[PDB]
């Protein structure tokens, strides 16, 4: 089985936040409660971070980890510069904190796995201090449309096979 994480670490990306390391795992998935220096980073999600933060020193091109359709390409989304791909399973890959104005696609575009979709960055809603990284989250198909479920819902990416989600578009 190949995960989006396996895909990224083979290309030299490294993991800054890994829900398999949070206390209680596999229980209480994504419970992170990351706060420092007066910023509570998981405040909006009641401390939950159902997602992987990864980063690269080598380059800043962010590759699409699966193929699919662009459904959100927002410079000022909830994760700063927010880019979302819906894959063949109709789950939504959230790419967050991209350099605003770096997105290479618009809503409706088709994307092949590995296509460069934007640049790694540190943009966020309130424009607070943040380290340059990619936030990658797999929002499920059955995510409620209410805002907290569009931002905080998340599948366990480490259990999600992408071996067959790379079809040519
Ligand atoms: Zn994150």
mmCIF file of N, CA, C and O in Angstrom, residues 9-110:
data_model
loop_
_atom_site.group_PDB
_atom_site.id
_atom_site.type_symbol
_atom_site.label_atom_id
_atom_site.label_comp_id
_atom_site.label_asym_id
_atom_site.label_seq_id
_atom_site.Cartn_x
_atom_site.Cartn_y
_atom_site.Cartn_z
ATOM 1 N N UNK A 9 7.509 11.462 1.304
ATOM 2 C CA UNK A 9 8.828 11.198 1.886
ATOM 3 C C UNK A 9 9.795 10.573 0.882
ATOM 4 O O UNK A 9 10.999 10.801 0.974
ATOM 5 N N UNK A 10 9.306 9.762 -0.055
ATOM 6 C CA UNK A 10 10.180 9.274 -1.121
ATOM 7 C C UNK A 10 10.706 10.415 -1.998
ATOM 8 O O UNK A 10 11.785 10.297 -2.593
ATOM 9 N N UNK A 11 9.984 11.531 -2.078
ATOM 10 C CA UNK A 11 10.451 12.685 -2.833
ATOM 11 C C UNK A 11 11.149 13.705 -1.953
ATOM 12 O O UNK A 11 11.260 14.871 -2.340
ATOM 13 N N UNK A 12 11.626 13.295 -0.778
ATOM 14 C CA UNK A 12 12.425 14.151 0.079
ATOM 15 C C UNK A 12 11.663 15.056 1.030
ATOM 16 O O UNK A 12 12.295 15.723 1.856
ATOM 17 N N UNK A 13 10.340 15.109 0.951
ATOM 18 C CA UNK A 13 9.581 15.804 1.980
ATOM 19 C C UNK A 13 9.770 15.120 3.319
ATOM 20 O O UNK A 13 9.983 13.908 3.396
ATOM 21 N N UNK A 14 9.683 15.899 4.388
ATOM 22 C CA UNK A 14 9.818 15.358 5.735
ATOM 23 C C UNK A 14 8.622 15.814 6.564
ATOM 24 O O UNK A 14 7.955 16.801 6.238
ATOM 25 N N UNK A 15 8.338 15.069 7.625
ATOM 26 C CA UNK A 15 7.113 15.235 8.395
ATOM 27 C C UNK A 15 7.412 16.055 9.638
ATOM 28 O O UNK A 15 8.237 15.655 10.474
ATOM 29 N N UNK A 16 6.719 17.193 9.767
ATOM 30 C CA UNK A 16 6.789 18.017 10.965
ATOM 31 C C UNK A 16 5.706 17.691 11.995
ATOM 32 O O UNK A 16 5.935 17.877 13.196
ATOM 33 N N UNK A 17 4.541 17.190 11.575
ATOM 34 C CA UNK A 17 3.510 16.796 12.532
ATOM 35 C C UNK A 17 2.746 15.596 12.001
ATOM 36 O O UNK A 17 2.235 15.609 10.877
ATOM 37 N N UNK A 18 2.638 14.582 12.858
ATOM 38 C CA UNK A 18 2.376 13.208 12.450
ATOM 39 C C UNK A 18 1.373 12.671 13.451
ATOM 40 O O UNK A 18 1.759 12.311 14.577
ATOM 41 N N UNK A 19 0.089 12.572 13.075
ATOM 42 C CA UNK A 19 -0.931 12.129 14.039
ATOM 43 C C UNK A 19 -0.666 10.755 14.613
ATOM 44 O O UNK A 19 -1.270 10.403 15.635
ATOM 45 N N UNK A 20 0.185 9.947 13.983
ATOM 46 C CA UNK A 20 0.556 8.685 14.607
ATOM 47 C C UNK A 20 1.406 8.894 15.849
ATOM 48 O O UNK A 20 1.647 7.931 16.579
ATOM 49 N N UNK A 21 1.877 10.118 16.094
ATOM 50 C CA UNK A 21 2.658 10.439 17.280
ATOM 51 C C UNK A 21 1.831 11.093 18.381
ATOM 52 O O UNK A 21 2.342 11.269 19.490
ATOM 53 N N UNK A 22 0.588 11.478 18.113
ATOM 54 C CA UNK A 22 -0.155 12.174 19.148
ATOM 55 C C UNK A 22 -0.514 11.180 20.242
ATOM 56 O O UNK A 22 -0.595 9.972 20.006
ATOM 57 N N UNK A 23 -0.680 11.688 21.461
ATOM 58 C CA UNK A 23 -0.936 10.809 22.596
ATOM 59 C C UNK A 23 -2.296 10.140 22.445
ATOM 60 O O UNK A 23 -3.287 10.786 22.095
ATOM 61 N N UNK A 24 -2.338 8.836 22.711
ATOM 62 C CA UNK A 24 -3.559 8.067 22.629
ATOM 63 C C UNK A 24 -3.762 7.322 21.325
ATOM 64 O O UNK A 24 -4.692 6.504 21.239
ATOM 65 N N UNK A 25 -2.934 7.588 20.313
ATOM 66 C CA UNK A 25 -3.106 6.968 19.000
ATOM 67 C C UNK A 25 -3.101 5.447 19.129
ATOM 68 O O UNK A 25 -2.222 4.895 19.802
ATOM 69 N N UNK A 26 -4.039 4.729 18.479
ATOM 70 C CA UNK A 26 -4.992 5.170 17.448
ATOM 71 C C UNK A 26 -6.269 5.806 17.991
ATOM 72 O O UNK A 26 -7.106 6.217 17.200
ATOM 73 N N UNK A 27 -6.435 5.866 19.306
ATOM 74 C CA UNK A 27 -7.611 6.525 19.839
ATOM 75 C C UNK A 27 -7.485 8.028 19.639
ATOM 76 O O UNK A 27 -6.387 8.568 19.471
ATOM 77 N N UNK A 28 -8.631 8.705 19.645
ATOM 78 C CA UNK A 28 -8.677 10.168 19.716
ATOM 79 C C UNK A 28 -7.901 10.815 18.566
ATOM 80 O O UNK A 28 -7.085 11.711 18.772
ATOM 81 N N UNK A 29 -8.164 10.343 17.345
ATOM 82 C CA UNK A 29 -7.347 10.681 16.178
ATOM 83 C C UNK A 29 -7.189 12.185 15.968
ATOM 84 O O UNK A 29 -8.160 12.947 16.001
ATOM 85 N N UNK A 30 -5.957 12.597 15.692
ATOM 86 C CA UNK A 30 -5.654 13.976 15.415
ATOM 87 C C UNK A 30 -5.593 14.894 16.615
ATOM 88 O O UNK A 30 -5.444 16.106 16.425
ATOM 89 N N UNK A 31 -5.724 14.382 17.835
ATOM 90 C CA UNK A 31 -5.728 15.275 18.989
ATOM 91 C C UNK A 31 -4.324 15.819 19.231
ATOM 92 O O UNK A 31 -3.434 15.112 19.714
ATOM 93 N N UNK A 32 -4.126 17.093 18.938
ATOM 94 C CA UNK A 32 -2.774 17.620 18.970
ATOM 95 C C UNK A 32 -2.616 18.765 19.945
ATOM 96 O O UNK A 32 -1.643 18.780 20.708
ATOM 97 N N UNK A 33 -3.539 19.723 19.940
ATOM 98 C CA UNK A 33 -3.498 20.843 20.876
ATOM 99 C C UNK A 33 -2.146 21.560 20.822
ATOM 100 O O UNK A 33 -1.480 21.765 21.837
ATOM 101 N N UNK A 34 -1.742 21.959 19.621
ATOM 102 C CA UNK A 34 -0.462 22.622 19.439
ATOM 103 C C UNK A 34 -0.637 24.115 19.683
ATOM 104 O O UNK A 34 -1.337 24.812 18.937
ATOM 105 N N UNK A 35 0.003 24.605 20.723
ATOM 106 C CA UNK A 35 -0.011 26.021 21.019
ATOM 107 C C UNK A 35 1.353 26.401 21.555
ATOM 108 O O UNK A 35 1.975 25.630 22.285
ATOM 109 N N UNK A 36 1.805 27.591 21.202
ATOM 110 C CA UNK A 36 3.032 28.120 21.777
ATOM 111 C C UNK A 36 2.990 29.611 21.567
ATOM 112 O O UNK A 36 2.263 30.099 20.701
ATOM 113 N N UNK A 37 3.749 30.330 22.390
ATOM 114 C CA UNK A 37 3.935 31.769 22.209
ATOM 115 C C UNK A 37 2.610 32.508 22.015
ATOM 116 O O UNK A 37 2.483 33.388 21.162
ATOM 117 N N UNK A 38 1.606 32.131 22.794
ATOM 118 C CA UNK A 38 0.312 32.786 22.751
ATOM 119 C C UNK A 38 -0.612 32.416 21.603
ATOM 120 O O UNK A 38 -1.781 32.812 21.635
ATOM 121 N N UNK A 39 -0.163 31.642 20.616
ATOM 122 C CA UNK A 39 -1.027 31.196 19.520
ATOM 123 C C UNK A 39 -1.492 29.771 19.792
ATOM 124 O O UNK A 39 -0.671 28.879 20.027
ATOM 125 N N UNK A 40 -2.806 29.547 19.755
ATOM 126 C CA UNK A 40 -3.372 28.204 19.854
ATOM 127 C C UNK A 40 -3.695 27.724 18.439
ATOM 128 O O UNK A 40 -4.724 28.100 17.856
ATOM 129 N N UNK A 41 -2.843 26.843 17.903
ATOM 130 C CA UNK A 41 -2.930 26.556 16.472
ATOM 131 C C UNK A 41 -4.111 25.668 16.108
ATOM 132 O O UNK A 41 -4.596 25.744 14.975
ATOM 133 N N UNK A 42 -4.614 24.864 17.029
ATOM 134 C CA UNK A 42 -5.757 24.014 16.726
ATOM 135 C C UNK A 42 -7.035 24.504 17.402
ATOM 136 O O UNK A 42 -7.946 23.716 17.666
ATOM 137 N N UNK A 43 -7.129 25.810 17.646
ATOM 138 C CA UNK A 43 -8.254 26.350 18.404
ATOM 139 C C UNK A 43 -9.559 26.112 17.677
ATOM 140 O O UNK A 43 -10.549 25.674 18.274
ATOM 141 N N UNK A 44 -9.582 26.412 16.382
ATOM 142 C CA UNK A 44 -10.819 26.311 15.632
ATOM 143 C C UNK A 44 -11.349 24.887 15.621
ATOM 144 O O UNK A 44 -12.567 24.682 15.571
ATOM 145 N N UNK A 45 -10.464 23.891 15.705
ATOM 146 C CA UNK A 45 -10.878 22.496 15.649
ATOM 147 C C UNK A 45 -10.877 21.832 17.020
ATOM 148 O O UNK A 45 -10.744 20.611 17.110
ATOM 149 N N UNK A 46 -11.060 22.607 18.084
ATOM 150 C CA UNK A 46 -11.063 22.020 19.419
ATOM 151 C C UNK A 46 -9.820 21.216 19.718
ATOM 152 O O UNK A 46 -9.898 20.168 20.371
ATOM 153 N N UNK A 47 -8.659 21.683 19.248
ATOM 154 C CA UNK A 47 -7.396 20.997 19.426
ATOM 155 C C UNK A 47 -7.080 19.900 18.427
ATOM 156 O O UNK A 47 -5.981 19.340 18.479
ATOM 157 N N UNK A 48 -7.952 19.619 17.470
ATOM 158 C CA UNK A 48 -7.724 18.482 16.590
ATOM 159 C C UNK A 48 -6.975 18.889 15.329
ATOM 160 O O UNK A 48 -7.187 19.977 14.786
ATOM 161 N N UNK A 49 -6.078 18.001 14.868
ATOM 162 C CA UNK A 49 -5.280 18.257 13.665
ATOM 163 C C UNK A 49 -5.294 16.954 12.879
ATOM 164 O O UNK A 49 -4.414 16.095 13.014
ATOM 165 N N UNK A 50 -6.354 16.760 12.094
ATOM 166 C CA UNK A 50 -6.574 15.463 11.451
ATOM 167 C C UNK A 50 -5.870 15.424 10.098
ATOM 168 O O UNK A 50 -6.502 15.343 9.054
ATOM 169 N N UNK A 51 -4.539 15.522 10.134
ATOM 170 C CA UNK A 51 -3.785 15.928 8.952
ATOM 171 C C UNK A 51 -2.297 15.798 9.226
ATOM 172 O O UNK A 51 -1.865 15.615 10.364
ATOM 173 N N UNK A 52 -1.518 15.902 8.158
ATOM 174 C CA UNK A 52 -0.067 15.856 8.222
ATOM 175 C C UNK A 52 0.497 17.215 7.840
ATOM 176 O O UNK A 52 0.133 17.774 6.803
ATOM 177 N N UNK A 53 1.386 17.736 8.676
ATOM 178 C CA UNK A 53 2.253 18.845 8.311
ATOM 179 C C UNK A 53 3.570 18.264 7.817
ATOM 180 O O UNK A 53 4.213 17.490 8.535
ATOM 181 N N UNK A 54 3.965 18.617 6.596
ATOM 182 C CA UNK A 54 5.217 18.142 6.023
ATOM 183 C C UNK A 54 5.966 19.335 5.457
ATOM 184 O O UNK A 54 5.389 20.392 5.203
ATOM 185 N N UNK A 55 7.262 19.156 5.228
ATOM 186 C CA UNK A 55 8.036 20.260 4.681
ATOM 187 C C UNK A 55 9.188 19.742 3.828
ATOM 188 O O UNK A 55 9.516 18.550 3.828
ATOM 189 N N UNK A 56 9.780 20.664 3.073
ATOM 190 C CA UNK A 56 10.921 20.383 2.209
ATOM 191 C C UNK A 56 11.951 21.498 2.329
ATOM 192 O O UNK A 56 11.594 22.676 2.277
ATOM 193 N N UNK A 57 13.219 21.131 2.510
ATOM 194 C CA UNK A 57 14.319 22.075 2.339
ATOM 195 C C UNK A 57 14.820 22.133 0.916
ATOM 196 O O UNK A 57 15.428 23.135 0.531
ATOM 197 N N UNK A 58 14.591 21.078 0.134
ATOM 198 C CA UNK A 58 15.190 20.992 -1.193
ATOM 199 C C UNK A 58 14.512 21.940 -2.178
ATOM 200 O O UNK A 58 15.188 22.744 -2.827
ATOM 201 N N UNK A 59 13.181 21.893 -2.294
ATOM 202 C CA UNK A 59 12.478 22.837 -3.171
ATOM 203 C C UNK A 59 11.129 23.210 -2.558
ATOM 204 O O UNK A 59 10.747 22.734 -1.478
ATOM 205 N N UNK A 60 10.389 24.061 -3.283
ATOM 206 C CA UNK A 60 9.093 24.533 -2.827
ATOM 207 C C UNK A 60 7.923 24.183 -3.748
ATOM 208 O O UNK A 60 6.782 24.517 -3.416
ATOM 209 N N UNK A 61 8.146 23.510 -4.870
ATOM 210 C CA UNK A 61 7.022 23.057 -5.684
ATOM 211 C C UNK A 61 6.243 21.984 -4.926
ATOM 212 O O UNK A 61 6.831 20.991 -4.484
ATOM 213 N N UNK A 62 4.941 22.167 -4.775
ATOM 214 C CA UNK A 62 4.081 21.215 -4.063
ATOM 215 C C UNK A 62 3.450 20.261 -5.085
ATOM 216 O O UNK A 62 2.653 20.713 -5.922
ATOM 217 N N UNK A 63 3.761 18.976 -5.037
ATOM 218 C CA UNK A 63 3.174 18.053 -6.010
ATOM 219 C C UNK A 63 1.798 17.591 -5.561
ATOM 220 O O UNK A 63 1.561 17.351 -4.375
ATOM 221 N N UNK A 64 0.882 17.481 -6.527
ATOM 222 C CA UNK A 64 -0.389 16.819 -6.278
ATOM 223 C C UNK A 64 -0.153 15.361 -5.914
ATOM 224 O O UNK A 64 0.469 14.619 -6.677
ATOM 225 N N UNK A 65 -0.698 14.926 -4.775
ATOM 226 C CA UNK A 65 -0.372 13.575 -4.328
ATOM 227 C C UNK A 65 -1.284 12.554 -4.976
ATOM 228 O O UNK A 65 -0.936 11.372 -5.052
ATOM 229 N N UNK A 66 -2.463 12.977 -5.425
ATOM 230 C CA UNK A 66 -3.326 12.171 -6.270
ATOM 231 C C UNK A 66 -3.806 13.015 -7.445
ATOM 232 O O UNK A 66 -3.675 14.243 -7.463
ATOM 233 N N UNK A 67 -4.341 12.332 -8.446
ATOM 234 C CA UNK A 67 -5.057 12.988 -9.522
ATOM 235 C C UNK A 67 -6.448 13.397 -9.056
ATOM 236 O O UNK A 67 -6.959 12.915 -8.047
ATOM 237 N N UNK A 68 -7.075 14.278 -9.816
ATOM 238 C CA UNK A 68 -8.433 14.648 -9.518
ATOM 239 C C UNK A 68 -8.741 16.032 -10.041
ATOM 240 O O UNK A 68 -8.057 16.553 -10.924
ATOM 241 N N UNK A 69 -9.778 16.610 -9.447
ATOM 242 C CA UNK A 69 -10.376 17.851 -9.913
ATOM 243 C C UNK A 69 -10.234 18.914 -8.841
ATOM 244 O O UNK A 69 -10.514 18.659 -7.666
ATOM 245 N N UNK A 70 -9.813 20.101 -9.257
ATOM 246 C CA UNK A 70 -9.647 21.226 -8.349
ATOM 247 C C UNK A 70 -11.021 21.762 -7.996
ATOM 248 O O UNK A 70 -11.777 22.186 -8.873
ATOM 249 N N UNK A 71 -11.353 21.756 -6.712
ATOM 250 C CA UNK A 71 -12.632 22.287 -6.261
ATOM 251 C C UNK A 71 -12.488 23.530 -5.404
ATOM 252 O O UNK A 71 -13.504 24.188 -5.138
ATOM 253 N N UNK A 72 -11.272 23.886 -4.981
ATOM 254 C CA UNK A 72 -11.021 25.115 -4.237
ATOM 255 C C UNK A 72 -9.593 25.547 -4.528
ATOM 256 O O UNK A 72 -8.677 24.722 -4.472
ATOM 257 N N UNK A 73 -9.411 26.836 -4.894
ATOM 258 C CA UNK A 73 -8.080 27.410 -5.142
ATOM 259 C C UNK A 73 -8.130 28.836 -4.601
ATOM 260 O O UNK A 73 -8.228 29.820 -5.335
ATOM 261 N N UNK A 74 -8.043 28.943 -3.282
ATOM 262 C CA UNK A 74 -8.349 30.171 -2.564
ATOM 263 C C UNK A 74 -7.088 30.702 -1.901
ATOM 264 O O UNK A 74 -6.473 30.000 -1.090
ATOM 265 N N UNK A 75 -6.707 31.942 -2.240
ATOM 266 C CA UNK A 75 -5.564 32.575 -1.591
ATOM 267 C C UNK A 75 -5.852 32.931 -0.142
ATOM 268 O O UNK A 75 -4.923 33.040 0.657
ATOM 269 N N UNK A 76 -7.113 33.080 0.223
ATOM 270 C CA UNK A 76 -7.517 33.510 1.554
ATOM 271 C C UNK A 76 -8.534 32.535 2.138
ATOM 272 O O UNK A 76 -9.580 32.920 2.663
ATOM 273 N N UNK A 77 -8.242 31.243 2.041
ATOM 274 C CA UNK A 77 -9.093 30.232 2.625
ATOM 275 C C UNK A 77 -8.800 30.074 4.101
ATOM 276 O O UNK A 77 -8.046 30.838 4.706
ATOM 277 N N UNK A 78 -9.402 29.041 4.692
ATOM 278 C CA UNK A 78 -9.231 28.843 6.129
ATOM 279 C C UNK A 78 -7.823 28.423 6.507
ATOM 280 O O UNK A 78 -7.444 28.621 7.660
ATOM 281 N N UNK A 79 -7.072 27.816 5.586
ATOM 282 C CA UNK A 79 -5.669 27.438 5.769
ATOM 283 C C UNK A 79 -4.734 28.375 5.014
ATOM 284 O O UNK A 79 -3.793 27.923 4.356
ATOM 285 N N UNK A 80 -4.980 29.680 5.077
ATOM 286 C CA UNK A 80 -4.261 30.610 4.219
ATOM 287 C C UNK A 80 -4.553 30.302 2.768
ATOM 288 O O UNK A 80 -5.705 30.093 2.380
ATOM 289 N N UNK A 81 -3.498 30.260 1.955
ATOM 290 C CA UNK A 81 -3.590 29.797 0.583
ATOM 291 C C UNK A 81 -3.971 28.335 0.556
ATOM 292 O O UNK A 81 -3.170 27.467 0.930
ATOM 293 N N UNK A 82 -5.203 28.063 0.130
ATOM 294 C CA UNK A 82 -5.846 26.764 0.279
ATOM 295 C C UNK A 82 -6.169 26.209 -1.104
ATOM 296 O O UNK A 82 -6.886 26.844 -1.886
ATOM 297 N N UNK A 83 -5.663 25.017 -1.395
ATOM 298 C CA UNK A 83 -5.897 24.350 -2.670
ATOM 299 C C UNK A 83 -6.468 22.972 -2.379
ATOM 300 O O UNK A 83 -5.903 22.215 -1.573
ATOM 301 N N UNK A 84 -7.579 22.631 -3.022
ATOM 302 C CA UNK A 84 -8.250 21.375 -2.713
ATOM 303 C C UNK A 84 -8.477 20.588 -3.992
ATOM 304 O O UNK A 84 -9.016 21.118 -4.975
ATOM 305 N N UNK A 85 -8.045 19.326 -3.968
ATOM 306 C CA UNK A 85 -8.269 18.368 -5.036
ATOM 307 C C UNK A 85 -9.227 17.306 -4.522
ATOM 308 O O UNK A 85 -9.010 16.725 -3.451
ATOM 309 N N UNK A 86 -10.263 17.037 -5.308
ATOM 310 C CA UNK A 86 -11.152 15.905 -5.102
ATOM 311 C C UNK A 86 -10.652 14.740 -5.943
ATOM 312 O O UNK A 86 -10.475 14.888 -7.152
ATOM 313 N N UNK A 87 -10.419 13.586 -5.312
ATOM 314 C CA UNK A 87 -9.838 12.450 -6.015
ATOM 315 C C UNK A 87 -10.932 11.510 -6.493
ATOM 316 O O UNK A 87 -12.122 11.777 -6.331
ATOM 317 N N UNK A 88 -10.510 10.374 -7.064
ATOM 318 C CA UNK A 88 -11.450 9.439 -7.673
ATOM 319 C C UNK A 88 -12.447 8.885 -6.661
ATOM 320 O O UNK A 88 -13.575 8.544 -7.033
ATOM 321 N N UNK A 89 -12.064 8.786 -5.387
ATOM 322 C CA UNK A 89 -12.994 8.365 -4.339
ATOM 323 C C UNK A 89 -13.906 9.495 -3.877
ATOM 324 O O UNK A 89 -14.691 9.295 -2.947
ATOM 325 N N UNK A 90 -13.795 10.677 -4.484
ATOM 326 C CA UNK A 90 -14.518 11.892 -4.096
ATOM 327 C C UNK A 90 -14.122 12.415 -2.707
ATOM 328 O O UNK A 90 -14.839 13.229 -2.124
ATOM 329 N N UNK A 91 -12.978 11.996 -2.169
ATOM 330 C CA UNK A 91 -12.411 12.646 -0.999
ATOM 331 C C UNK A 91 -11.579 13.844 -1.429
ATOM 332 O O UNK A 91 -11.005 13.850 -2.519
ATOM 333 N N UNK A 92 -11.470 14.841 -0.532
ATOM 334 C CA UNK A 92 -10.942 16.167 -0.858
ATOM 335 C C UNK A 92 -9.584 16.355 -0.197
ATOM 336 O O UNK A 92 -9.499 16.451 1.032
ATOM 337 N N UNK A 93 -8.519 16.415 -1.001
ATOM 338 C CA UNK A 93 -7.184 16.676 -0.457
ATOM 339 C C UNK A 93 -7.000 18.170 -0.244
ATOM 340 O O UNK A 93 -7.102 18.965 -1.186
ATOM 341 N N UNK A 94 -6.752 18.552 0.990
ATOM 342 C CA UNK A 94 -6.585 19.949 1.365
ATOM 343 C C UNK A 94 -5.092 20.236 1.407
ATOM 344 O O UNK A 94 -4.347 19.580 2.145
ATOM 345 N N UNK A 95 -4.639 21.156 0.562
ATOM 346 C CA UNK A 95 -3.278 21.671 0.603
ATOM 347 C C UNK A 95 -3.355 23.063 1.191
ATOM 348 O O UNK A 95 -3.984 23.947 0.607
ATOM 349 N N UNK A 96 -2.749 23.250 2.352
ATOM 350 C CA UNK A 96 -2.912 24.510 3.039
ATOM 351 C C UNK A 96 -1.608 25.238 3.251
ATOM 352 O O UNK A 96 -0.540 24.617 3.194
ATOM 353 N N UNK A 97 -1.700 26.559 3.495
ATOM 354 C CA UNK A 97 -0.567 27.433 3.792
ATOM 355 C C UNK A 97 0.341 27.645 2.583
ATOM 356 O O UNK A 97 1.539 27.846 2.729
ATOM 357 N N UNK A 98 -0.196 27.601 1.382
ATOM 358 C CA UNK A 98 0.627 27.862 0.213
ATOM 359 C C UNK A 98 0.850 29.355 0.048
ATOM 360 O O UNK A 98 0.005 30.171 0.431
ATOM 361 N N UNK A 99 1.991 29.707 -0.552
ATOM 362 C CA UNK A 99 2.252 31.101 -0.898
ATOM 363 C C UNK A 99 1.118 31.634 -1.761
ATOM 364 O O UNK A 99 0.835 31.098 -2.838
ATOM 365 N N UNK A 100 0.448 32.671 -1.262
ATOM 366 C CA UNK A 100 -0.701 33.219 -1.958
ATOM 367 C C UNK A 100 -0.293 33.766 -3.325
ATOM 368 O O UNK A 100 0.659 34.548 -3.448
ATOM 369 N N UNK A 101 -1.063 33.404 -4.344
ATOM 370 C CA UNK A 101 -0.732 33.748 -5.708
ATOM 371 C C UNK A 101 0.187 32.767 -6.393
ATOM 372 O O UNK A 101 0.658 33.052 -7.501
ATOM 373 N N UNK A 102 0.460 31.626 -5.776
ATOM 374 C CA UNK A 102 1.329 30.618 -6.364
ATOM 375 C C UNK A 102 0.581 29.479 -7.024
ATOM 376 O O UNK A 102 1.222 28.587 -7.580
ATOM 377 N N UNK A 103 -0.744 29.470 -6.973
ATOM 378 C CA UNK A 103 -1.480 28.299 -7.431
ATOM 379 C C UNK A 103 -1.486 28.226 -8.950
ATOM 380 O O UNK A 103 -1.707 29.230 -9.633
ATOM 381 N N UNK A 104 -1.216 27.028 -9.470
ATOM 382 C CA UNK A 104 -1.048 26.781 -10.895
ATOM 383 C C UNK A 104 -2.337 26.333 -11.574
ATOM 384 O O UNK A 104 -2.350 26.163 -12.800
ATOM 385 N N UNK A 105 -3.422 26.170 -10.820
ATOM 386 C CA UNK A 105 -4.679 25.690 -11.372
ATOM 387 C C UNK A 105 -5.825 26.497 -10.786
ATOM 388 O O UNK A 105 -5.686 27.168 -9.762
ATOM 389 N N UNK A 106 -6.973 26.394 -11.442
ATOM 390 C CA UNK A 106 -8.199 27.034 -11.001
ATOM 391 C C UNK A 106 -9.261 25.956 -10.787
ATOM 392 O O UNK A 106 -9.121 24.813 -11.230
ATOM 393 N N UNK A 107 -10.336 26.345 -10.097
ATOM 394 C CA UNK A 107 -11.450 25.437 -9.855
ATOM 395 C C UNK A 107 -11.964 24.890 -11.180
ATOM 396 O O UNK A 107 -12.187 25.642 -12.135
ATOM 397 N N UNK A 108 -12.132 23.569 -11.255
ATOM 398 C CA UNK A 108 -12.569 22.912 -12.469
ATOM 399 C C UNK A 108 -11.457 22.237 -13.250
ATOM 400 O O UNK A 108 -11.735 21.338 -14.055
ATOM 401 N N UNK A 109 -10.214 22.635 -13.017
ATOM 402 C CA UNK A 109 -9.081 22.028 -13.694
ATOM 403 C C UNK A 109 -8.935 20.567 -13.305
ATOM 404 O O UNK A 109 -9.284 20.153 -12.198
ATOM 405 N N UNK A 110 -8.392 19.795 -14.235
ATOM 406 C CA UNK A 110 -7.946 18.440 -13.986
ATOM 407 C C UNK A 110 -6.470 18.484 -13.637
ATOM 408 O O UNK A 110 -5.726 19.306 -14.173
#
